[PDB]
Amino acid sequence: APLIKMRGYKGLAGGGRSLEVPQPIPARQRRSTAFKWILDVVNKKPSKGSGRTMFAHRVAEEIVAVVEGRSSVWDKRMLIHKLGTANRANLNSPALQ
Amino acid sequence: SMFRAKKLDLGCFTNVRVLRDHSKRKAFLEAEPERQALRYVIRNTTLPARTRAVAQLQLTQMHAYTRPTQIRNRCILGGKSRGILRDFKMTRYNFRMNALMGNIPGVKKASW
Amino acid sequence: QKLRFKKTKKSGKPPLPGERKAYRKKIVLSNNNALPVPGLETLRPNDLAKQDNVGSVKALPEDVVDALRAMEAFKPTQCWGIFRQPSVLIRQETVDLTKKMKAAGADGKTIRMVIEGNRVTGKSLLLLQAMTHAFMNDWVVLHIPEAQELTTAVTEYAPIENSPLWTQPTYTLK
Amino acid sequence: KRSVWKGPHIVPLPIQRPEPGKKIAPIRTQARSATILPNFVGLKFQVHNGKDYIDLTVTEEMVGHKLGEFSATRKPFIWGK
Amino acid sequence: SASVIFSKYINNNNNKLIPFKIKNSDLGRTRYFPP
Amino acid sequence: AYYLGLPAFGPVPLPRMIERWTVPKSHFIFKKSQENFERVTLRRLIQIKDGHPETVQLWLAFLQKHAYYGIGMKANVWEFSKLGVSKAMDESKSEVEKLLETRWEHLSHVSDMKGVGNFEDFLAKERLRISGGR
Amino acid sequence: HIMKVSDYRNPAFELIHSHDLALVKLFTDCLSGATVMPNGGAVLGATTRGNSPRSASMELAIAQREAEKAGEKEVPQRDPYSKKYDDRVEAVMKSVEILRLKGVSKTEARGLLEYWAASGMLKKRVDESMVSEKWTLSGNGVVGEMERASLLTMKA
Amino acid sequence: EFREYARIAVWEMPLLSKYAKPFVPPTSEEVLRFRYTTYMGEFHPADRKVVVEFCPKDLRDLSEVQQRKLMKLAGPRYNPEKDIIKMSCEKFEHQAQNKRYLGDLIEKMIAAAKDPKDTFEDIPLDTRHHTFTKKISFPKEWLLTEERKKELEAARQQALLKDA
Amino acid sequence: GEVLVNGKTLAEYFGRVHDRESAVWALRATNRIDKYNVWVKVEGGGTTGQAEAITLAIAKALLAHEPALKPALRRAGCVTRDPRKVERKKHGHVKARKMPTWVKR
Amino acid sequence: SVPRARLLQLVKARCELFSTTFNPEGIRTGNKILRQRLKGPALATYYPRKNVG
Amino acid sequence: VFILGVNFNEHKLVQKALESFYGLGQQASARILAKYSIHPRAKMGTLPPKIVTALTAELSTMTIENDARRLVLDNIKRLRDMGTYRGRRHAMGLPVRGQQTRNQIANARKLNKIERHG
RNA sequence: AAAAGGGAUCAAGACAAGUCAUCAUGGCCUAAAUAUUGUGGGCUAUAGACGUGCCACAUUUUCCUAAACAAAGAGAUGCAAAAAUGUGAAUUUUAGCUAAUCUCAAAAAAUAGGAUAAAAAUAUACAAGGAUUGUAGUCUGAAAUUCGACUGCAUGAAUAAG
Numbered sequence A: 001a002p003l004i005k006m007r008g009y010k011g012l013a014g015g016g017r018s019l020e021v022p023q024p025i026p027a028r029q030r031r032s033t034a035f036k037w038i039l040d041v042v043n044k045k046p047s048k049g050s051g052r053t054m055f056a057h058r059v060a061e062e063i064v065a066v067v068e069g070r071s072s073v074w075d076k077r078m079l080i081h082k083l084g085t086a087n088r089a090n091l092n093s094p095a096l097q
Numbered sequence B: 001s002m003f004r005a006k007k008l009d010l011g012c013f014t015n016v017r018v019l020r021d022h023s024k025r026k027a028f029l030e031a032e033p034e035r036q037a038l039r040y041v042i043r044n045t046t047l048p049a050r051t052r053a054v055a056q057l058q059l060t061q062m063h064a065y066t067r068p069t070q071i072r073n074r075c076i077l078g079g080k081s082r083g084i085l086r087d088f089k090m091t092r093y094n095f096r097m098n099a100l101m102g103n104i105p106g107v108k109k110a111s112w
Numbered sequence C: 001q002k003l004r005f006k007k008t009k010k011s012g013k014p015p016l017p018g019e020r021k022a023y024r025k026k027i028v029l030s031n032n033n034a035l036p037v038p039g040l041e042t043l044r045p046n047d048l049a050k051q052d053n054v055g056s057v058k059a060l061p062e063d064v065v066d067a068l069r070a071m072e073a074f075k076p077t078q079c080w081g082i083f084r085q086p087s088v089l090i091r092q093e094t095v096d097l098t099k100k101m102k103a104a105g106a107d108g109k110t111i112r113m114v115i116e117g118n119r120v121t122g123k124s125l126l127l128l129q130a131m132t133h134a135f136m137n138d139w140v141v142l143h144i145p146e147a148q149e150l151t152t153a154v155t156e157y158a159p160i161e162n163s164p165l166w167t168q169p170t171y172t173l174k
Numbered sequence D: 001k002r003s004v005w006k007g008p009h010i011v012p013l014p015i016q017r018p019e020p021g022k023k024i025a026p027i028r029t030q031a032r033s034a035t036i037l038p039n040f041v042g043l044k045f046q047v048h049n050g051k052d053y054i055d056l057t058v059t060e061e062m063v064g065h066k067l068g069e070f071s072a073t074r075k076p077f078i079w080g081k
Numbered sequence E: 001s002a003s004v005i006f007s008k009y010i011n012n013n014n015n016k017l018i019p020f021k022i023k024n025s026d027l028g029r030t031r032y033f034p035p
Numbered sequence F: 001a002y003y004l005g006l007p008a009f010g011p012v013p014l015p016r017m018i019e020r021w022t023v024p025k026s027h028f029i030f031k032k033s034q035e036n037f038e039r040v041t042l043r044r045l046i047q048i049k050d051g052h053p054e055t056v057q058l059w060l061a062f063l064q065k066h067a068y069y070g071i072g073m074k075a076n077v078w079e080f081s082k083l084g085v086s087k088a089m090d091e092s093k094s095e096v097e098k099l100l101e102t103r104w105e106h107l108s109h110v111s112d113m114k115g116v117g118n119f120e121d122f123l124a125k126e127r128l129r130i131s132g133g134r
Numbered sequence G: 001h002i003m004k005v006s007d008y009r010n011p012a013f014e015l016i017h018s019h020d021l022a023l024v025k026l027f028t029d030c031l032s033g034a035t036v037m038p039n040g041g042a043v044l045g046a047t048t049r050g051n052s053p054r055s056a057s058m059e060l061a062i063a064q065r066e067a068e069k070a071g072e073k074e075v076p077q078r079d080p081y082s083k084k085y086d087d088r089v090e091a092v093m094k095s096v097e098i099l100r101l102k103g104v105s106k107t108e109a110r111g112l113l114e115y116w117a118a119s120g121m122l123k124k125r126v127d128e129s130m131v132s133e134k135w136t137l138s139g140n141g142v143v144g145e146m147e148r149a150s151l152l153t154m155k156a
Numbered sequence H: 001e002f003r004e005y006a007r008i009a010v011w012e013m014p015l016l017s018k019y020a021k022p023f024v025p026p027t028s029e030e031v032l033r034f035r036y037t038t039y040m041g042e043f044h045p046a047d048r049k050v051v052v053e054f055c056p057k058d059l060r061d062l063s064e065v066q067q068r069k070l071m072k073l074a075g076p077r078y079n080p081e082k083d084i085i086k087m088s089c090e091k092f093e094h095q096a097q098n099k100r101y102l103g104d105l106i107e108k109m110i111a112a113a114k115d116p117k118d119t120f121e122d123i124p125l126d127t128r129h130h131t132f133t134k135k136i137s138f139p140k141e142w143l144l145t146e147e148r149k150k151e152l153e154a155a156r157q158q159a160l161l162k163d164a
Numbered sequence I: 001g002e003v004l005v006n007g008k009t010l011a012e013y014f015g016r017v018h019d020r021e022s023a024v025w026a027l028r029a030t031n032r033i034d035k036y037n038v039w040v041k042v043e044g045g046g047t048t049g050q051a052e053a054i055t056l057a058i059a060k061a062l063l064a065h066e067p068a069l070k071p072a073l074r075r076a077g078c079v080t081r082d083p084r085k086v087e088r089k090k091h092g093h094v095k096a097r098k099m100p101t102w103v104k105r
Numbered sequence J: 001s002v003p004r005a006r007l008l009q010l011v012k013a014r015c016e017l018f019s020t021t022f023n024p025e026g027i028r029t030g031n032k033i034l035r036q037r038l039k040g041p042a043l044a045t046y047y048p049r050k051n052v053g
Numbered sequence K: 001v002f003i004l005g006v007n008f009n010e011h012k013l014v015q016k017a018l019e020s021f022y023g024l025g026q027q028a029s030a031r032i033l034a035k036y037s038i039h040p041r042a043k044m045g046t047l048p049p050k051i052v053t054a055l056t057a058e059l060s061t062m063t064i065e066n067d068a069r070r071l072v073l074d075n076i077k078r079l080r081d082m083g084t085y086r087g088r089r090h091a092m093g094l095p096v097r098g099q100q101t102r103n104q105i106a107n108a109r110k111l112n113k114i115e116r117h118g
Numbered sequence L: 001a002a003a004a005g006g007g008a009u010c011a012a013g014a015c016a017a018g019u020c021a022u023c024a025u026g027g028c029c030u031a032a033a034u035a036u037u038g039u040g041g042g043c044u045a046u047a048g049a050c051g052u053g054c055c056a057c058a059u060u061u062u063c064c065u066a067a068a069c070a071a072a073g074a075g076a077u078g079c080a081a082a083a084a085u086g087u088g089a090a091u092u093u094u095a096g097c098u099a100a101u102c103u104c105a106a107a108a109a110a111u112a113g114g115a116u117a118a119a120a121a122u123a124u125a126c127a128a129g130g131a132u133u134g135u136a137g138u139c140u141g142a143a144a145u146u147c148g149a150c151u152g153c154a155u156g157a158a159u160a161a162g
């Protein structure tokens, strides 16, 4: 789960650009965003078998690849963390004051 | 034209078509038992073919007014034929205005 | 000439034939993660007949699991991949049935009964316990796993000369 | 009549068969829903298309069809000139 | 004796007895019911 | 029903009947704005058990004479009888003629009524006119 | 499945009875006593309540054998105006015994729950008060439902 | 108007007791139960139907097989649950004509049921027009009687030993 | 501990184990499943609707025997009567709230 | 289990006992027009006639 | 294998092969398999050589792709010769079954022709 | 029980907002016609283009099997049971009820099993989909051709989530 969220302020960065500012998100908003990513990866995989356990086993295999650190959501997490780290100075920006 | 009463008997809102739909309800009332014997002989597959063909030709010669499908309910206050309520013989509108004033018994504005 | 908008038009190895069907039918009769239950005893040739075992769980012999697995005794719906060693429960009906099957072969008699019940009441796995008591006592087990493969028109069939019967060669061979 | 069990739709027509060699004028009719019976195969009709009467010569291929199917009521829509 | 049909309408007696309960809750006056 | 000895049971509140109509507020294009109407029919049920047949008819006669405006009443009367209805309904012809001796004065007509024509047909079509058509 | 008309078609496009299949005609004989196994044995036929069509003939027969064994003078009988019966099925199930399975006793359920708990699949204190809660949620001891409530849950 | 109705209930209602007659239960010969509907001074086309319902076992002149043949002829008019044949008639313009017909139609059913020509013993009684209802009742074994209180304490004492 | 819902058992009436637990939750929260026999009769509603109704029913009945369990049942969620009810369809709306496509142009 | 010819003898005894049409072959006798009740008189009296003014 | 000139792959249902011929559907095909005792779920590879030849001789008599299109194309051609309203629609490539022509007549213009595919 | 919810209601004024085609009404026009009646036709036409809807593009879907749980409303201008017939629409024949009684009437998703896969792109493996059209029928009604709603058989278009 990412520890921050990005929300921009309409027209405060430059000539028609928004000032992106990172914000922290609570627990419920942290797990939700994480599990929604897992389903995204699952819905893009191809089908492997038949029966009722098709979707259930496609989600569980992603929950095992996340604990093993070999999942595609890890690249999706660190990608949002970089934006915050890069925009950590916008908190005290002069356009918000 | 031949079925239009020479003396007006309608007591409700009179109209060109209200006077024309009233002449059809009376012409069908007189020929309904006769028109139901031609539809029975046409559908009775036990009678000879010629018997059913003669009734089929005579039903086609009946005047249009005698046909029951020509009858269409009309508002007794406005004379329209579109959006008539069978329970009140009025349009959806005339029903509303009268219901609010209190002229239609029992009808009340519904909230729930 | 039409001038509306029209969307313009624009990966992995496929599974082998029969791979998908074999996925929703494989039976997992073991789970390493599960703990080895201490005191779990194995069955014996005359262990499904004793009534003092009613209400106790016993593990199936490893040699019987090779036979029950050969004639498709286990099923996907049944959950065996949750424990380590396939084990059954000696029910009060098992001892009721086994004693009849044990006395039938004793005097060459034949018992003919129809196991009946409501939804998941143990009906099938009681046949798996009747086959287990057969293998362990030197019997000949001829089992038809699914009776719907013979009537749903899914296997080859051919008639017999001068007879109303019909044979099923492909199924009889397998 | 659509349903076959109650015969076809027949309308009173002045279909009087003439003596051989006589000249009979075409039948003017507005009954555009009259099933073309076999008994008048070969007569000349003039079906009313709402405004005019279009001549028609019944043949053995029209038996069962309606007289109104051989006289268009509208005109073919043609863009431009 | 009695009719078999006259007996089939007597047995259908599952009526609830009038309880004559005692009110323990205070009751307000009713509204003004217009004509 | 108490003075007549008829044990009444009720009033039993029956399920009220609700009709509904949704009509546009305007007599024209403005259909996006409608409103709901209804006509709720409130009813009751008074059941009389072990009531004498004739006595019940007095109870019903008394209620029609003193009927309260705005109420529609419908009654179903149950009566027991022996076998051979044909005979019973024939023996009681003279008994009814004695009770109507002093009631024939209500109806009066000219000799050989010619406006009625077929009596049985007159009743049939004159009952439709009063009822309203059916 | 084998107590009804099969889904097969003969050359004249007429459904073949499930008892006409050679392999199914051999079992129905041993079940009805026609074929006498000399060396003895057992002929067991188990029903199923998942993906199986209803056959009044089979159900009626089972209900008839349970009544006769139970010492009842009023045994169920055919519905004279029902046309979903099969004479063949009655002859096969005319002299077969019946085994009616129901929920396991409270004692057996305990021995089956301690095995699920000793294996780490049931993290609960298995006592009488707890053996009665699974015995009640599972329709008075239905083993299959006792599994959906303790092993196939989303709490473990 | 409330006074006009209080004046009736204080002075005119008491006089209704001078013409009332006590109810007498029907004898063994009164086997029919006719029903007539009134609309209290209103013309409704449904005020001409006459319903009649009798029980076959009330006719003590018919035999066993004759009573069962009367139920097969009734058809859908027979209620197997209550064992009552109910039939109506609204064919004629007047109520008196609809009751006379049912008074004669029932005499033909009893005359046809006595016909020894065909007893219809081969035909089994058909009850497919009726839908039988199932009524569930509180189990009699769950009632907490004095004998069950002892049976429960013994079960609760056996559970403690097992755990202990 | 023998529960009968409308004549059938808990497993024959409710196919969803989620409903079986909520139906007898009062006995489960207070740990009295093996001390009471419940014979309920339900009418109307769906699967969960009836199960939740049985919850409040057994709760009130259980309090009659042991009125001191209300503080616990209060915290178990077996005393409140959920008044949530399907909203009505309103004229001009496709549903209680859903409105048709609003064309700006 | 009951022959069809033996069942029609009971269906025929009811038609005589109630005077109803007996059509075991489902022939189109057009009786559906005879059982249909007339609605003419109900339609004619739709518009209130001229009354005292 | 070969069935009346056309070649089919092994992993193809015989039921679906007989249904690929114009004029043959579920009813006709279902009656052809039963004639030669071929279970509906039989794939092409399993058919023996003898039975395959029988199917060819069985379809040779049926009214199939070319013999069936003729009947449909003759029915449509007769409507244009007589001069029926239904005939002109095929010639003009317009809806033939009383459909609102204000919008959504794409398939009509595309497929309605005197020389229909079938 | 309770931290309740929804409906109706929502002013004046403005938009010379809509309606003189509900009705009503002033002025101005038609009065052998701008009035009245019937037959048939049209309002259903179709290059291009704009609005709302339905539905589909298979792997949480669809298909097959089975012994669960609703509410509300309708039937005197009628709802129609159970039977018998047809693959089906439906027909034949009317038991009851004009109704908390009888009838429409059956809930579906769901729950639990089962079948199908290189489930469209390797052309001898063309998926799902149901448009278009041929043909034989049924129901309502003088009447189904322009121009109706359904049913059987065959035909099998676009459509890779925009």
Ligand SMILES: Nc1ncnc2c1ncn2[C@@H]1O[C@H](COP(=O)(O)OP(=O)(O)OP(=O)(O)O)[C@@H](O)[C@H]1O
Residues within 6 Å of the ligand: C075, C077, C078, C079, C087, C088, C089, C090, C091, C117, C118, C119, C120, C121, C122, C123, C124, C125, C126, G047, G048, G049, G050, G143, G144, G147
């Ligand atoms: N005696 C037992 N010991 C252990 N597990 C059992 C026992 N009996 C039944 N089970 C389990 O119960 C579940 C269902 O059993 P089973 O598959 O035999 O049902 P069934 O009678 O065949 O039902 P159906 O009517 O659907 O065919 C399985 O998970 C099974 O392991």
Ligand SMILES: [K+]
Residues within 6 Å of the ligand: I086
């Ligand atoms: K809803």
Ligand SMILES: [K+]
Residues within 6 Å of the ligand: L011
């Ligand atoms: K305002």
Ligand SMILES: [K+]
Residues within 6 Å of the ligand: none
């Ligand atoms: K304006």
Ligand SMILES: [Mg+2]
Residues within 6 Å of the ligand: C123, C124, C125, G047, G048
């Ligand atoms: Mg099984």
Ligand SMILES: [Mg+2]
Residues within 6 Å of the ligand: K103
């Ligand atoms: Mg468009």
Ligand SMILES: [Mg+2]
Residues within 6 Å of the ligand: none
């Ligand atoms: Mg307010």
Ligand SMILES: [Mg+2]
Residues within 6 Å of the ligand: L017
């Ligand atoms: Mg505007």
Ligand SMILES: [Mg+2]
Residues within 6 Å of the ligand: L020
């Ligand atoms: Mg004007």
Ligand SMILES: [Mg+2]
Residues within 6 Å of the ligand: none
């Ligand atoms: Mg239009």
Ligand SMILES: [Mg+2]
Residues within 6 Å of the ligand: none
């Ligand atoms: Mg589909």
Ligand SMILES: [Mg+2]
Residues within 6 Å of the ligand: none
């Ligand atoms: Mg029916």
Ligand SMILES: [Mg+2]
Residues within 6 Å of the ligand: none
């Ligand atoms: Mg309906």
Ligand SMILES: [Mg+2]
Residues within 6 Å of the ligand: none
């Ligand atoms: Mg499923």
Ligand SMILES: [Mg+2]
Residues within 6 Å of the ligand: none
């Ligand atoms: Mg795909």
Ligand SMILES: [Mg+2]
Residues within 6 Å of the ligand: none
């Ligand atoms: Mg396809």
